[PDB]
Amino acid sequence: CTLSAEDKAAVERSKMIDRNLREDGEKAAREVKLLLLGADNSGKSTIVKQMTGIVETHFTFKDLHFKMFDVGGQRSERKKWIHCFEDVAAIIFCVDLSDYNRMHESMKLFDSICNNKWFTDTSIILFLNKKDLFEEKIKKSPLTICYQEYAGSNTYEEAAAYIQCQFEDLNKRKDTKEIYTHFTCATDTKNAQFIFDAVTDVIIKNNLKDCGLF
Amino acid sequence: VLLVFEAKIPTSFHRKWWGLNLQFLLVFLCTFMQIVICVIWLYTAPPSSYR
Amino acid sequence: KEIEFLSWTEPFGIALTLFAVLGIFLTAFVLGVFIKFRNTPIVKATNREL
């Protein structure tokens, strides 16, 4: 080499920094990122019992780390900060079944997020929170409160089926995404397991798509 | 197909052992032994017609 | 003396040649159908180039 001693020492320092960057990147690679969205009353803050900037939550279930980001605090225009979340595994959308106006702007937000120009290859885990409470409420009063055009009996089955069919029918990019809908019980113990299953399935689909086998 | 389906790692973007066109190289590597044996056979003892 | 070998004109040779030609045609048809429906999920599931 034509270097001096100090130049060689600087090169050695740079190599050490490169090694540290490699280890940190490989460590950060072993994680799953989720975009937690929904109304303020949806219950997103209590979605997983395992537990102003972006709201961040982290949990590990069955040897898999998950970082959920809530970005409802950011009240600026979403167009100029939504591209920072294009490289995430899935969008977890929580809907409040009981409240009617809440679920209405929940449909608005669902359509807005699903029809973005960035999230054209990402899927939604749709948690229909407040299942049985809204079931009793719909026993008391029909779904005509918000879904006025909808015609159905007072049974919970028809109303819940219509609501799920709606929330899946606002979707337009059905070619490269798939919604995973889950009726959320008050004491549901399958939430983390459901997220695990959905993440594994979508990662398998991602392998299939890059390898061209899908 | 097996390697793609089995790996549970979230970071499966690494494709240095599967995908792209390395599969063609592996096929050629498998057939290289037969090519070599045929070459040696035809250079050291060629078969010939007999009456 | 008579010379003995497998022949192109003896009946067994004709049968073997016909069977080989039939196999060639069958594989050609398979390749043609694969190329025609190249962008379909069943065809993409099996590695197309391979």
From Swiss-Prot, chain A:
Residues 184-189 are annotated as: G5 motif. Its EC number is 3.6.5.-. It is found in: Nucleus; Cytoplasm; Cell membrane; Cytoplasm, Cytoskeleton, Microtubule organizing center, Centrosome. The modification ADP-ribosylcysteine is found at C211. A lipid is attached at C1 (S-palmitoyl cysteine). One of its GO terms (cellular component) is cell cortex. Residues 33-46 are annotated as: G1 motif. It catalyses: GTP + H2O = GDP + phosphate + H(+). Mg(2+) binds at S45. The keyword Isomerase does not apply. The modification Deamidated glutamine is found at Q74. Residues 66-75 are annotated as: G3 motif. Keywords: ADP-ribosylation, Cell cycle, Cell division, Cell membrane, Cytoplasm, Cytoskeleton, Disease variant, Epilepsy, GTP-binding, Host-virus interaction, Hydrolase, Intellectual disability, Lipoprotein, Magnesium, Membrane, Metal-binding, Mitosis, Myristate, Nucleotide-binding, Nucleus, Palmitate, Transducer, Transport. It is a peripheral membrane protein; Lipid-anchor. Signal peptide: none annotated. One of its GO terms (molecular function) is GTPase activity. Residues 125-132 are annotated as: G4 motif. Guanine nucleotide-binding proteins (G proteins) function as transducers downstream of G protein-coupled receptors (GPCRs) in numerous signaling cascades. The alpha chain contains the guanine nucleotide binding site and alternates between an active, GTP-bound state and an inactive, GDP-bound state. Signaling by an activated GPCR promotes GDP release and GTP binding. The alpha subunit has a low GTPase activity that converts bound GTP to GDP, thereby terminating the signal. Both GDP release and GTP hydrolysis are modulated by numerous regulatory proteins. Belongs to the G-alpha family. G(i/o/t/z) subfamily. This is Guanine nucleotide-binding protein G(i) subunit alpha-1. The gene is GNAI1.
UniProtKB/Swiss-Prot annotation, chain B:
It comes from the Eukaryota. Residues 1-21 are cytoplasmic. Changing P10A: Does not affect G-protein-coupled receptor activity. Changing I9A: Does not affect G-protein-coupled receptor activity. It is found in: Cell membrane. The chain crosses the membrane at residues 22-44. Residues 1-21 are annotated as: Intracellular loop 2 (ICL2). Expressed in the temporal lobe, frontal lobe, parietal lobe, hippocampus, and cerebellum. Also found in kidney, lung, liver, heart, skeletal muscle, placenta. Changing L26Q: In HYPOC1; increased G-protein coupled receptor signaling pathway; does not affect cell membrane localization. Ubiquitinated by RNF19A; which induces proteasomal degradation. N-glycosylated. G-protein-coupled receptor that senses changes in the extracellular concentration of calcium ions and plays a key role in maintaining calcium homeostasis. Senses fluctuations in the circulating calcium concentration: activated by elevated circulating calcium, leading to decreased parathyroid hormone (PTH) secretion in parathyroid glands. In kidneys, acts as a key regulator of renal tubular calcium resorption. Ligand binding causes a conformation change that triggers signaling via guanine nucleotide-binding proteins (G-proteins) and modulates the activity of downstream effectors. It is linked to Hypocalciuric hypercalcemia, familial 1: A form of hypocalciuric hypercalcemia, a disorder of mineral homeostasis that is transmitted as an autosomal dominant trait with a high degree of penetrance. It is characterized biochemically by lifelong elevation of serum calcium concentrations and is associated with inappropriately low urinary calcium excretion and a normal or mildly elevated circulating parathyroid hormone level. Hypermagnesemia is typically present. Affected individuals are usually asymptomatic and the disorder is considered benign. Hyperparathyroidism, neonatal severe: A disorder characterized by severe hypercalcemia, bone demineralization, and failure to thrive usually manifesting in the first 6 months of life. If untreated, NSHPT can be a devastating neurodevelopmental disorder, which in some cases is lethal without parathyroidectomy. Belongs to the G-protein coupled receptor 3 family. Homodimer; disulfide-linked. Interacts with VCP. Interacts with ARRB1. This is Extracellular calcium-sensing receptor.
